Amino acid sequence: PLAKDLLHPSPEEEKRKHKKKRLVQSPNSYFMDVKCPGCYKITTVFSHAQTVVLCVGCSTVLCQPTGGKARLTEGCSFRRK
Amino acid sequence: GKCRGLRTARKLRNHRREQKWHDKQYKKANLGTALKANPFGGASHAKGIVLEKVGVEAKQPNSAIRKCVRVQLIKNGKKITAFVPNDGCLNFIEENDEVLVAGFGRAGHAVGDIPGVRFKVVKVANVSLLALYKGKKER
Amino acid sequence: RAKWRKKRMRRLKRKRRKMRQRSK
Amino acid sequence: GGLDVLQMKEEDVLKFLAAGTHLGGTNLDFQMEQYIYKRKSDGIYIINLKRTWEKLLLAARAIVAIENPADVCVISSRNTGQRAVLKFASASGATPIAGRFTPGTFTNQIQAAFREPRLLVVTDPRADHQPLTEASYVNIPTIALCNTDSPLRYVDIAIPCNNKGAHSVGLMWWMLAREVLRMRGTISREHPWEVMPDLYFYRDPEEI
Amino acid sequence: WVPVTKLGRLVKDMKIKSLEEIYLFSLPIKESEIIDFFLGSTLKDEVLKIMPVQKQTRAGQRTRFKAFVAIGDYNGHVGLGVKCSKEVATAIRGAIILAKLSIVPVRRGYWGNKIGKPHTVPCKVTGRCGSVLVRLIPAPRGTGIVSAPVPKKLLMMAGIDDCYTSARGCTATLGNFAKATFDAISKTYSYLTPDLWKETVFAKSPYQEYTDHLA
Amino acid sequence: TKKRRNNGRAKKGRGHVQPIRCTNCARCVPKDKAIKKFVIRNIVEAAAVRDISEASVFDSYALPKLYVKLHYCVSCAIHSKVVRNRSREARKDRTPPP
Amino acid sequence: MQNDAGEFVDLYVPRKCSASNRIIGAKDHASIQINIAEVDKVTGRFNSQYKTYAICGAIRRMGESDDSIMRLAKNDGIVSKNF
Amino acid sequence: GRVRTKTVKKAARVIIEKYYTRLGNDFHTNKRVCEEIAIIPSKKLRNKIAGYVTHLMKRIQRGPVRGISIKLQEEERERRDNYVPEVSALDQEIIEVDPDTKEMLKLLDFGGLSNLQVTQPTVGMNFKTPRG
Amino acid sequence: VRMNVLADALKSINNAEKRGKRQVLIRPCSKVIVRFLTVMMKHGYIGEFEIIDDHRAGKIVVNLTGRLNKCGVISPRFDVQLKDLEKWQNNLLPSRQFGYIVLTTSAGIMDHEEARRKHTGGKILGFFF
RNA sequence: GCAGCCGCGGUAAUUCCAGCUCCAAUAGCGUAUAUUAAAGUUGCUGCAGUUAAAAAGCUCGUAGUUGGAUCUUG
RNA sequence: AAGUCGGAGGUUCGAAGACGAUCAGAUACCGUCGUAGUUCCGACCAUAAACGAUGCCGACUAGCGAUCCGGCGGCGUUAGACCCGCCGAGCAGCUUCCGGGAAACCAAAGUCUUUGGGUUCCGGGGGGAGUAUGGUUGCAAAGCUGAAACUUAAAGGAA
Ligand SMILES: [Zn+2]
């Protein structure tokens, strides 16, 4: 591979690279609206939350902090833009 | 590695200044030693009085009798052992006669198979030893 | 051996010191 | 060949799929990665047959560009490609080396089997590594039927194909001989070739 | 002369006009008669060193002589070959044959102004063999070869009239000295200079052009 | 000359290892440098397994084994001929003999 | 090389690698000069035309000779661009 | 101790590669042929050469010898090797194709072919061999 | 730590040319690098390079032409005059016919030939040939 | 006795003592000592430190040394 | 680690030492004992083939299969375990004509006469000699700093 195109890399390899070693660094994280089955309000939470987020009114717990992406509870939506 | 900086002149100058002393040639010619221990005291030649004729064994593998003379320097009283270079020139050197001796060729080093003799006879009785060896001068 | 020569040296330093302290 | 007359036909796909030329094993080379399509669930890599054909024509163009057909040397040390290189030599007029390659036929001029070819087609880059390395001391290009794990230490034209199966290695020599004759003009490319691909295949001693 | 290789048959039959055709295609020269056919007129050889190497056997020492021969036409072509044989005459004879098969084209340039024929090296090249490295440096037209006696014999036979030379390593090893110098001379015509940036116009190889004559 | 890349011991990225004693001579040898050999042999050898089996009180009693993990220093492992000196290229072979 | 007056003073102009622009030395026996024949755009037969590529021994030895020829064939329209 | 020297074997192979048509499976016939087509200074050497020729002649009739190379013998054995079945082994009625291979052909113009039979992809990636 | 950015920029180019690469990715970019690559590009030693903006130091992807033998830096950046410019031409440049020594003068970044035509000295950044 | 160095001499010494002859510089030519180049064997240019002499047992740390990118281009 | 001082403890082992063997002699190897020590606490010592005989930081220059930790998303099996990949970190391995080197060998010991990323320590033929002397540290043993006269044409590395 002597003539590999560095200015126009395939999107399958840019997502493979580390979030810093990419052509232009971009986070692997995102935000998401969590809708608990008990209430109707949606809460915008971070994927790698690292804190114990709660819904408005203290209905239940939305996600739990982990070493990576936060682990959501049962019956929740995510993947917003 | 080395320091390549714009303001490292003192660091480089002091490093070379202190590392030159590890060079035995530079350190020998930049200290009080090796100049007072030198019997000539920094001179190329020196006159002395022949104390006695001495034969020095040639080192291995050679085997011969090096005809030398024990000389006492007049300038400082030190007793050295020169070397009568040519063949049979020891017979020209009398007893208690003034002779001009010089280095053997190397700077304070023993030349050839002779163990420690680092000097050689040049003149004798104010007459050069090369003129007596060739018969152009007498006495 | 370089270690026993080192041991003979330290046994010689200890003698030169005691011989030097006697005339101190 | 980027033309419509040189495209892979449907009859060529049914031969490649039956011979298993698209199955190249579990190991992969970093210089053969461009020819691989996708790795299956059982570790076997799939060779891109579209890129296999383009490298196959590119090899045929390099063979027909040699005026004297005897200046092309086809070599196969492994028995699976010994019959395939002897039939290729009779069809193309090349000098075959199917037995044991004596080290010195390219550099030692006083040898009996000393040759000076202009192109060196190789069945396996590993089984035939000796003529590859010896084709470096003399300015001789080389073509090889490189597998997924085959090295390209001196291969100038690598044809990505399964050079392990007998029906696959025999077909790659049948496809190349068919294309060399089509570019020379011996066969018209309009009607199917008279030679059956099973002529180049290797026969086990228990069956022959 | 009965040619064995295809390259020797084309030279014998006057198909290849000069030696630069072989250098253009980087073809191996396996027959010394090919060299004597082009440069055999003004070719001069020199015995650099007769080096007796000994193999420790029960018969005291088995002395075998190795010779270093420098071959060059004194303009653009120089060669260096070594041969270790039992006899001194055979070692010299075999080294001359290897010194012909190793003849490389010597590229010569100018120092500053480009007037007349080239006199010095085109740029600074450094050849290495073992621990010895020999750097060739351009020099004015009247400077000459400022070098040791060993590289001077190689630089004069390579047509280099002027050259500044610097050598580092065990230059007392005439084998590694001459081979590093010959490596520095061989690095010419391979150093990409701005005057060689033009796209190369590919020609037909001697095996391709005369493929009908070779049948 | 560095005769071995691992210096004769399987220690990588590690300062000190606890030593053991060679079975022949009780000498301090590092655990990784020790030439270990886990020998599993029957208590009754083949020369005597026939008499012990026919004199047993049980219908089918399998003779036990001796699970002993032997440790050897470099010197004693070679005198006992459990490891031989190999060629300069054969030393790089890390596979156990068949 | 010129002589500042138009004259050419070099013995020969050496080739350059078609992949890395490296000058192919006179003793680089690992180098090759492969000719790839051209075909008629209708019948697909040899029309006495060919493209020439020279690859030095360095690019070959590192294993990039096959990928280089494949890319050089793209720029000349020999191999398809769906490759 | 019936091993033949390289003098006996080399001379026997050259006699075969040059006079294969004159030799046979009879020693006493080959003994007189080698006496004429080759000037052997000894009679014991001739009997050893002719006796090894008879041995090699019994091998030629069964196949090629790794030392003897006869042009008229290699061309005929290669000509008689032209064997093809009544129907090729490649044109099959049905062809098993992995679903991943089917997708490769889908990207090419050969998307849907009746000769293709997609097989069920086996679950579990147990292709690697256990270590140790 | 990266105490010099022009050093790692020219080192990646010099190593990519030795490997026969067509393009090289200079990860840290700067004004001195872009003007250094321009001096090499005006003389035809490298192709067109594309600066990549990422709201940080920035990256550059240089197109390699294969005409470059070696590019390097001279650290530290010594003060070079006109009378002392011929000394560096004999130690760094491979010949008096080609090769350039890049200088950062008050008139901008240029090679030693343009610095002599403009008759202005300065500091030395690096060389290429 | 020669021999700066490697060495030469133990009865045919191309090396010593000499004859002859030859070579080198030349009205100059040797010797001793210091010094410069040779020495990239003192290093800025420009050396070395796995095994040839060599990187502190390891870490912290002041002075010292050296320090990302960015601000008027076209 | 050994050693030193003061307490506690001293099973095993074991300098020293004794005795028994072997030998021409053993004051050694081997055997039977056994002091200090080995163990613990406090205070010293600051030296190791303290080794990867390879300073630290940073960039770049090949591939492959494993492995430790974390993270990521994918058939399937199992009640997290396993399977298949990717990313970062790390201990290593191997194949290579990347290159380097005197070579052994080294993905670094590469990017070095095409010589300059930053910086510390340090080497200058082999001996004398890590000696003498002075200073300093320590209860001591010794640590650190550290010469010269003189002697020598080799010493040494890899193969
Ligand atoms: Zn033991």
CSV table of N, CA and C and ligand atoms in Angstrom, one decimal, chain F residues 22 24-25 27 73 76, ligand 1:
chain,number,residue,atom,x,y,z
F,22,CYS,N,17.1,-27.5,43.4
F,22,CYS,CA,17.3,-28.7,42.5
F,22,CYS,C,17.2,-30.0,43.3
F,24,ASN,N,18.6,-32.9,42.6
F,24,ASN,CA,19.8,-33.6,42.8
F,24,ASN,C,20.7,-33.0,43.9
F,25,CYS,N,21.0,-31.7,43.7
F,25,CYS,CA,21.7,-30.9,44.7
F,25,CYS,C,20.9,-29.8,45.2
F,27,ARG,N,20.3,-26.7,45.7
F,27,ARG,CA,20.9,-25.4,45.4
F,27,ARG,C,19.8,-24.4,45.0
F,73,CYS,N,18.5,-27.9,38.4
F,73,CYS,CA,19.3,-26.8,38.1
F,73,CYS,C,19.9,-27.1,36.7
F,76,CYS,N,22.8,-29.9,36.9
F,76,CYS,CA,22.3,-31.3,37.1
F,76,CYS,C,21.4,-31.8,36.1
L,1,ZN,ZN,21.4,-29.6,41.0
